[PDB]
Design a protein around this ligand. Structure first.
Ligand SMILES: CC(=O)N[C@@H]1[C@@H](O[C@@H]2O[C@H](CO)[C@H](O)[C@H](O)[C@H]2O[C@@H]2O[C@@H](C)[C@@H](O)[C@@H](O)[C@@H]2O)[C@H](O[C@@H]2O[C@@H](C)[C@@H](O)[C@@H](O)[C@@H]2O)[C@@H](CO)O[C@@H]1O
Ligand SMILES: [Ca+2]
Ligand code: NI
Length: 141
């Protein structure tokens, strides 16, 4: 993949916002995973929480990297989730399911040369907030 993080500074949004955990914290160029350092997102405790970045145009995506929240022993909240690519009309062009990050600070998701404008993370879990320290997106080589 290319090295430029194309998610950086892009428009981001999420299902809801709590504890001041603004969606733009996942694309601020800071992977610091300590919620107290203000670079980690947070939605409401809700069903099927989600977070999205608009790349602003259609790009050929090869890698999405998720960085989990690291403080407070709540890393497990990022489990049973999909990483979704959508085209400009917001139709799904790819989707990968993950049970867990297994303790790891991050997860690398590789997509097979998908032309997509939106990258979405979707929890499939009830009454669970979605918190991401950072989402980075890289073009196919
Ligand atoms: C229980 C409630 O959510 N607490 C909120 C505070 O967050 C908790 O603070 C604790 C120390 O005071 C400790 O750090 C806990 O780990 C932390 O709880 C975690 O994070 C929050 C944001 C939620 O996701 C909880 O479900 C989770 O268990 C919060 O404190 C502020 O953020 C934390 C991370 C830390 O930086 C702290 O020093 C900050 O004051 C406060 C203020 O918004 O609000 C709740 O009380
Ligand atoms: Ca961040
Ligand atoms: Ni600190």
């Amino acid at each position: 993949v290319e090295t430029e993080n194309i998610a950086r500074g892009k428009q981001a949004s999420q299902s809801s916002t709590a504890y001041g955990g603004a969606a733009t914290r996942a694309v601020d160029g800071n992977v610091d995973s300590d919620y107290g350092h203000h670079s980690v997102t947070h939605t409401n405790f809700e069903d099927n929480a989600w977070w999205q970045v608009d790349l602003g145009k259609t790009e050929n995506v090869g890698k999405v990297k998720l960085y989990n929240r690291g403080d407070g022993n709540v890393a497990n909240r990022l489990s049973n989730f999909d990483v979704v690519l959508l085209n400009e009309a917001k139709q799904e062009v790819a989707r990968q399911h993950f049970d867990s990050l297994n303790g790891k600070a991050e997860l690398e998701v590789f997509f097979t040369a998908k032309d997509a404008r939106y990258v979405k993370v979707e929890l499939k879990t009830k009454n669970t907030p979605l918190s991401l320290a950072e989402v980075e997106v890289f073009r196919s080589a």
